[PDB]
Design a protein around this ligand. Structure first.
Ligand SMILES: Cn1c(=O)c2c(ncn2C)n(C)c1=O
Ligand SMILES: Cn1c(=O)c2c(ncn2C)n(C)c1=O
Lengths: 360, 360
């Protein structure tokens, strides 16, 4: 089948397995099963499935150059699809919880899950917990007999933990580190001294890159029994590089993409987030521009938000972005060349991942 | 050492390991490390450590009757302490998140974690996520070389999933099942037809008993390499029985124990929870009493809450509780007798667990 058709068919199988198990072993009743089916569909479906399909595409690459029985090819592709859905459900977990944490209104043009009338925060926090628990159920069920079960569970845990740490870095990025204290309400920074490239890079590395690029690439290697055939330090370096670029694109879109196309209203400015735009602006502003940014950033007032967007346009951050992009292109191509030494097939899969990222 | 002294010493070791790893591998800075240290202390310490100490006590029982080198005894006890802290951190996760979900005010006489001024819900949801992630970090680190790693991780996952399902059952227990729908705000039941013993038993089994009694008992067996030496169906039956009694005690205390001793104000009546008191009251009420309960249950109005408490006293639910307790005593003693067939040592550990529960 087309890879996407196989991936979506496996969703139906995994959902049926999870819901049937709830009936047979957890005494669930049909109405709560229906609630959870709708929750799964609403939180897990409707995106592009980039992360899950990366697992599939990596596995397909190795299948084309490795001798296998037909039944083994089918097993590997089925495993890649389940593993990809583990990542999609993990993402669903972090979007449900982050939308609650951030007080978000919309996502993908629909209300955030916790805002559905019959859900509410009381249920939605636990729904997000269940989403992540489902990732572990699918691994222990589908991969019970597999040689890579241990490495895959270990990786998944490390990536999940990194991502939770990243969320902490993200939501505290507008506070002075020396003022962080559970006992004291957290004031917004006034000097913005921690709005630097290195600190931004730290936030993004943990909050996004591990689960968006490192986990799908390595899971593809694991279900293919091909990890020995790559230099893991290069996989990490290229995942963190492409992942950062992905997030910079998202940062720019939050500010400048119309809500209709964006699927939501961006509020990074009002939320005083350490965005690529803010960091890059502060890296080239003169004193008067820095002062005007400070006087307006992180406030809900729409005229103050408009001031900040005006500063960004006046500062020609398009030029900085094109320079950033050119450098990422140089570095990603270099890492892909290095990947070819041990694994030309994996290098081409990484090239495909970059192309999809770059021309999005 | 006294078992408790060893258990608390291992907390310091585990905390140091987790925080040092955040420095060495996650680029954490000292102020965020301090925040997380306070979060850990505030959410994990201050209880009686009943669940974690059960692991230790089960392991101690087997040590007394099994030939081991001294270094192996120390290893087993250290493993039991780490495993016990995994359960204590798991509980900490579900208390942080449940307090947010339920809008709780106090716990153990202190503000709920999310209500600390420098925390807020935005941070506290993610802090609870981190608490559970820490359970997995400690398992993969401390038990990396152990034969029971796989079984322990598998058990932990199944117990965590059961508990999340239980929370869903708990927070939806005042809604008619046929009206559950994400699209429609959930009305409180008017007939209370789902306030039955069997439905109550289902809620409690999943929401509490798996992590409070089954997980500590089986983890004690696993770190002792002694699970083959017991009939697992009896361990499950006795865990679910003692766990239910534990929750019934908690239900009664929420209504009748003074806030000073309780550590909080109970709001089960206002929250329309399917409590043992409500179910038992409806199991003996006459028509006029049922009508008065319906007219007053699940409302914040303090005079309506007082009406409900008056109905409970007038109905002499003390008598039903003493009858319930007598039956649990009969059944637990019977299961302990059965446990002696294969494992007299484990049976005595279960007897200790019951005694601590019963005379609380
Ligand atoms: C409108 N607009 C953009 O659309 C944009 C941008 N930087 C990148 N993009 C895409 N800047 C600074 C901008 O003003
Ligand atoms: C005051 N009170 C109690 O203290 C109590 C109880 N049932 C059990 N207990 C302990 N009932 C019904 C009660 O009215």
């Amino acid at each position: 089948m087309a890879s996407m058709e196989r991936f979506l068919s496996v969703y139906d199988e995994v959902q049926a397995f999870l819901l049937d198990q709830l009936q047979s072993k957890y005494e669930i009743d049909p109405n709560r099963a229906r609630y959870l089916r709708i929750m799964m569909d609403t939180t897990c479906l409707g995106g592009k499935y980039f992360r899950g399909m990366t697992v599939v595409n990596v596995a397909e690459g190795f299948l084309a150059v490795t001798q296998h029985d037909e039944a083994t090819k089918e097993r590997i592709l089925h495993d890649a699809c389940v593993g990809g859905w583990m990542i999609e459900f993990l993402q669903a977990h972090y979007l449900v919880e982050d939308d609650i944490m951030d007080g978000s209104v919309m996502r993908r043009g629909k209300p955030c899950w916790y805002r559905f009338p019959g859900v509410t925060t009381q249920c939605a926090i636990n729904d997000g917990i269940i989403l992540k628990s489902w990732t572990q159920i699918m691994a222990w069920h589908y991969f019970a007999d597999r040689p890579f079960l241990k490495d895959l569970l270990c990786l998944f845990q490390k990536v999940d933990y990194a991502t939770a740490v990243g969320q902490m870095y993200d939501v505290t990025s507008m506070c002075d580190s020396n003022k962080l204290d559970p006992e004291v309400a957290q004031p917004m920074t006034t000097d913005f001294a921690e709005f630097t490239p290195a600190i931004y890079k730290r936030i993004v590395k943990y909050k996004t890159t591990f689960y968006t690029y490192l986990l799908p690439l390595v899971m593809g290697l694991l279900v293919s029994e091909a990890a020995a055939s790559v230099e893991m330090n290069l996989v990490e370096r290229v995942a963190h590089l492409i992942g950062e670029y992905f997030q910079v694109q998202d940062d720019v879109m939050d500010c400048f993409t119309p809500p209709e196309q964006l699927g939501k209203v961006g509020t990074d400015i009002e939320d005083a987030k350490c965005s690529w735009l803010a960091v890059t602006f502060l890296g080239k502003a003169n004193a008067a521009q820095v002062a005007e940014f400070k006087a307006n950033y992180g406030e809900k007032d729409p005229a103050k938000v408009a001031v900040v967007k005006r500063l960004y346009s006046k500062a020609n951050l398009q030029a900085d972005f094109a320079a950033y992009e050119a450098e990422v292109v140089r570095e990603v191509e270099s890492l892909i060349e290095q990947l070819k030494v041990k694994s030309p097939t994996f290098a081409e899969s990484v090239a495909v991942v970059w192309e999809k990222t770059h021309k999005r």
